[PDB]
Amino acid sequence: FRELYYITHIDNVPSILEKGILSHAEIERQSINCKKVYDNSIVLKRKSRLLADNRSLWEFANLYFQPRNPMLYRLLVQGLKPKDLAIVAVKWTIMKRDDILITDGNAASSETQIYRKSEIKNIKNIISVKDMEYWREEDGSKRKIMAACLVPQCVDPRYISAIYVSDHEVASNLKKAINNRNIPVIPDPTFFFLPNREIKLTQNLSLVEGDMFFSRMQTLTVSVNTVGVMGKGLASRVKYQFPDVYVVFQDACKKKELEFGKPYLYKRESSLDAFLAEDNHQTWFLLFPTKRHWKNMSEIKGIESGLRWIVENYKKEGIKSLAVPALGCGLGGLEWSIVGPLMCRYLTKLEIPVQIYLPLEKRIPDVQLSPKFLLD
Ligand SMILES: Nc1ncnc2c1ncn2[C@@H]1O[C@H](COP(=O)(O)OP(=O)(O)OC[C@H]2O[C@@H](O)[C@H](O)[C@@H]2O)[C@@H](O)[C@H]1O
16 A cells, blocks of 8 residues: 645645645745645745755645654644644655655754655655654654655646545535545544544543544553563553653652552653644653563452552542553453453543543454443
């Protein structure tokens, strides 16, 4: 498989299907009122970048290999909603053109290198950013994930595969507004950092297929052991994305403030939007011990304990909303048939929004996601 992706306001989709995907230079030349949302800070950065052969970056159209990236995230936290946005799919076939350029990351950034087709090396390395589900500044992944194919002047509408959209309601309105069965409108929340599936059990409790860290819950729970290693699993991702959490985990562990059955709440004053978005909600981390050593299995008395702790202390500690992952359901080697009900039993008591994040490496029978099973 492969497509390329252009992020735009959904108001522009008819204009694009008619005129094409135009460079920010071609919009000025043609005196078009393409009513879009990119902060002036970004616009004045993209223009001010010059290239080889008497050419600017704003003369090209930016087709991302991965649209689920810091730019899309920046637009959504700057007040724009998923219903306001559309990702326009462009066929692999545009790469056959010999007047295009390919960036190894964010075209604007100095550190990024733009190559012409002839002199490109390690393309399989560039296009792999399509498989990146998160990023960070330190390893440059926050730059690399916005790797793009730069097409000069315009992109002919005959190169457009489909238009991706946040939900079914936005799809119906666009299907009518473009009036062309031949161009699919696909609803896919995952492009817009929305869950793949949500099952509401109560007003507050829901089950979620998705990424916990792109949930907007105020407290993210993290399954840990009682040694000091976050070697493999979800803990591994926490160590790379949120290394200060790892340090707090170790410090708290070796000060007995985190024992098996005694969760530690890290009231992290860091802003998650600033780190994730391209450069005022708080995000805390709850360290929940589900086992003793990183080798041996998860114990149910350690979980029951931790869940009771949450019920007793969410008021005291000022937890506004909570994301817990399926506890011990991965490396721990416990089954959702046992943990699911146990977690629901306790977290249904919470008078705040709660998202239990279903295990992603594992098929749950549909009947084990019903409230009949989980709340009885
Ligand atoms: N981004 C994510 N969003 C939601 N769920 C996720 C995500 N990433 C992983 N999961 C799911 O979370 C579940 C629990 O993750 P694990 O880390 O495997 O938790 P556990 O089984 O309790 O193992 C704990 C052990 O591993 C380390 O995390 C920890 O240091 C301890 O040694 C898994 O089933 C996995 O599918």
